[PDB]
Amino acid sequence: SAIPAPGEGPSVSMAQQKCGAEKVVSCCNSKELKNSKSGAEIPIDVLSGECKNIPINILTINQLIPINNFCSDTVSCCSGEQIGLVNIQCTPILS
C-alpha cells in the first residue's frame, strides 16, 4: 500500500483529530449544512463534487495520506458507517 504525496498540503490526520475516532470522515459542502439546518437530515453520499464518503479502510493506517487524496471541503464526520447504518447523523469536523 503506497501513500501518494506530491505536495498539495496537510494530511487527514490533521482533520480527523478534530472529531471522534469512531466517526467516519467525509467531505461535503451541503446547502443544509452551510446554513446550519441539518441535525440528522444530511446525506453523506450525494453527488460527485458535492458530497462523498471516503473509504475508511485506508484512513486508519494510511492517515499519512495528504489531502491530495481527499476533498478540500467543509469536512463532515458522521457516525461510523458500518454495514447496517443506513441512516445516521453527520457533523462538521472543521467549521
Question: What cell was used for 63?
Answer: 492517515
50, 2 contact by CB (below 8 A): no
Enclosing domain of residue 72: 1-95
Measured between alpha carbons, how far is 56 from 67 in angstroms, rounded to an integer? 14
Contact 48/73 with Cβ under 8 angstroms?
no
Experimental method: NMR
Domain count, the chain: 1
Rg (CA), the chain: 13
Over the range 11-42, which residues count as b (16 or more CB within 10 Å of their CB) and which as e? bbeebbeebeeebbbbbbbbeebeeeebeeeb
What's CA 83's distance to the chain center, in Å? 17
Q: What is the 3-state secondary structure (H, E, C) of the chain?
A: CCCCCCCCCCEHHHHHCCCCCCEEEEEECCHHHHCCCCCCCCCCCCCCCCEEECCHHHHHHCCCCEHHHCCCCCEEEEECCCCCCCCCCEEECCC
Task: Count the Cβ atoms, other than its own, within 10 Å of residue 57.
Answer: 9
Residue with cell 481527499: 70
Grid cell, residue 86, equals: 443506513
